[PDB]
Amino acid sequence: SLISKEELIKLAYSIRPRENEYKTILTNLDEYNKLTTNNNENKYLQLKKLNESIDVFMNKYKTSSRNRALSNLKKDILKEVILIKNSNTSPVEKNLHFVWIGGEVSDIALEYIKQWADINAEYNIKLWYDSEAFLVNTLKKAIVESSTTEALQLLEEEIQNPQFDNMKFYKKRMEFIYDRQKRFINYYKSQINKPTVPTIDDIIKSHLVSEYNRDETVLESYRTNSLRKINSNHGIDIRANSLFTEQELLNIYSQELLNRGNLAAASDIVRLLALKNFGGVYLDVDMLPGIHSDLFKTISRPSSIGLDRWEMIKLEAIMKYKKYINNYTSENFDKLDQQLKDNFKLIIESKSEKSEIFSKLENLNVSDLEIKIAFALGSVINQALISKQGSYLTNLVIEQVKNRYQFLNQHLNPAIESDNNFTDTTKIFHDSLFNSATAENSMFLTKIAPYLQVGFMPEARSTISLSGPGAYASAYYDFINLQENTIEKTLKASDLIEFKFPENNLSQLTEQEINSLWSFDQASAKYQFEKYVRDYT
Ligand SMILES: O=c1ccn([C@@H]2O[C@H](COP(=O)(O)OP(=O)(O)O[C@H]3O[C@H](CO)[C@@H](O)[C@H](O)[C@H]3F)[C@@H](O)[C@H]2O)c(=O)[nH]1
Ligand SMILES: [Mn+2]
Numbered sequence: 001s002l003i004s005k006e007e008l009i010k011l012a013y014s015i016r017p018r019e020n021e022y023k024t025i026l027t028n029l030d031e032y033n034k035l036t037t038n039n040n041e042n043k044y045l046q047l048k049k050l051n052e053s054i055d056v057f058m059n060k061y062k063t064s065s066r067n068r069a070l071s072n073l074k075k076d077i078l079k080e081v082i083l084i085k086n087s088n089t090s091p092v093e094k095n096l097h098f099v100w101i102g103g104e105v106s107d108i109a110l111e112y113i114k115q116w117a118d119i120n121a122e123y124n125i126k127l128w129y130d131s132e133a134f135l136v137n138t139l140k141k142a143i144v145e146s147s148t149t150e151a152l153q154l155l156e157e158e159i160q161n162p163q164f165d166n167m168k169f170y171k172k173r174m175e176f177i178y179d180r181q182k183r184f185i186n187y188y189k190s191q192i193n194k195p196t197v198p199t200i201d202d203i204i205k206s207h208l209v210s211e212y213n214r215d216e217t218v219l220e221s222y223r224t225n226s227l228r229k230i231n232s233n234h235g236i237d238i239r240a241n242s243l244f245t246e247q248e249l250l251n252i253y254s255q256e257l258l259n260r261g262n263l264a265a266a267s268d269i270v271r272l273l274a275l276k277n278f279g280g281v282y283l284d285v286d287m288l289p290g291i292h293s294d295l296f297k298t299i300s301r302p303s304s305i306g307l308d309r310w311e312m313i314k315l316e317a318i319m320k321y322k323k324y325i326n327n328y329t330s331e332n333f334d335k336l337d338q339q340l341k342d343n344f345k346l347i348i349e350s351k352s353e354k355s356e357i358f359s360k361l362e363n364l365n366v367s368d369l370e371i372k373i374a375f376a377l378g379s380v381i382n383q384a385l386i387s388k389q390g391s392y393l394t395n396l397v398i399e400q401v402k403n404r405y406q407f408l409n410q411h412l413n414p415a416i417e418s419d420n421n422f423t424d425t426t427k428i429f430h431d432s433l434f435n436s437a438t439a440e441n442s443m444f445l446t447k448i449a450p451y452l453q454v455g456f457m458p459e460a461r462s463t464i465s466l467s468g469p470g471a472y473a474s475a476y477y478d479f480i481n482l483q484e485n486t487i488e489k490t491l492k493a494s495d496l497i498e499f500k501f502p503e504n505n506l507s508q509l510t511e512q513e514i515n516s517l518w519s520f521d522q523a524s525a526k527y528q529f530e531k532y533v534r535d536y537t
Helices: 005-011 020-033 040-060 067-087 107-119 136-154 166-191 200-211 216-231 247-260 263-278 307-322 338-349 392-417 422-434 442-448 469-481 511-516 522-536
Strands: 095-099 124-129 235-237 280-283 372-376 379-387
Touching (some): 040 067, 040 392, 095 107, 095 263, 136 166, 166 200, 166 247, 166 422, 263 379, 263 392, 307 338, 379 469, 392 469
Parallel strands (some): 095 124, 095 280
Antiparallel strands (some): 280 379, 372 379
């Protein structure tokens, strides 16, 4: 329990009269100690109120003899949130949420989702999709491909020089991409208010037919096939549900889905709303169930192979003998000594049903305060999440996303609403953005400055700071330190063991996940550019 008001009076006793701010602290502490109710949120809020009062006294009387005790009390307050969070716990709602928006869900994604379904029959699979937006990927592809060709043609004389800086190509291509997105968006805005009430896909189809030499029948078949494939495999339509219950979040989802064509960012929004409204477990479609602990207890690992590769090899080894996922890679497993191999086959074949290989989720016991998250490379990663419906931390993350977008859009909207090309739009945005800089927000500003080229140029990673892991990391800071609207600071994986997605319940090092991580750094960028040059000729 926290120290009592009487104990604090004894500990902080001084020759000096009690300051008014000290009396307030004593009252807040006593009120926390006397709380009759068992509602976690109420306890947390009263903690917060007390912590805030202590800071007011410490800032005001910096040399006070009471500060040592009050400093200790703050440390005890930090421990209590953990205790509070860990004291009343119970199973999360039995929902597995997946999201696939913007096109046909792939067969490979369905296979991965199938593993989860087989192992966890009591959970109700929810594959969220947007019934009006099956052609967004098709459009983004068309725009990028056409732009790549335009940039190569413009730069044809230079691209052969082996010393050519491929960043001249990516910047020029971005100018063409921006012009093409802007043509689409202005066309969309001219259609969307018509009395025919067209859908996103109606408008994309028309635009592709008129400007990208496409065939309406082929696009319509692709769209209807996507709608049928998804509905047959646990699909649930965002347009027909209660995820979006305010305009602000919908506008954020729409700006990513329609203006940027950033499907991952749109999915970042949907997953939060799905957890807020329904609770359960959110998984990217490249995640796989966790391997039973004992399964490979009996297999020391060669020190030549890495801690992560060892996990990839365990998955590859399981597939090589059960074929649960068709054509699953065997590359890192084939290179092993036969006793290793023969040992793997031996333990593997020992088992009878898949539930002996992968672990069930069963009850995932969590606090209504928290959200649990996977880790990667020292950071949180929002590819796997656990949250009760309406959890306090899930709401903190949503608030972080809203505040970040409100700030982004304050500076971005005047620029994009201009009739200006990419270069001049970027200048208007940046001039506004960086005139707002402070010591607290400067890193954030620098990270969101390349927002418009996210997905199209190497090193544009603004999504992490808007809808992705950075927002979760700052919300964790908020929660742990009883703060709100943290922008400068993030908590790291080493800070968040109490919030880790339980290691035994998840396999992150799948073939599909490793396929996704191939990011847009300078190394990937050089390779894609070389292939573009290779194909152009
Ligand atoms: O065409 C598409 C492409 C992707 N999505 C959604 O985005 C999710 C993640 O995509 P993906 O794994 O390819 O990118 P990744 O770099 O790993 O995402 C991280 O960064 C992402 C953004 O912060 C984050 O969403 C993700 O969890 C991180 F791991 C995927 O499981 C879908 O829900 C889609 O619906 N349609
Ligand atoms: Mn991934």
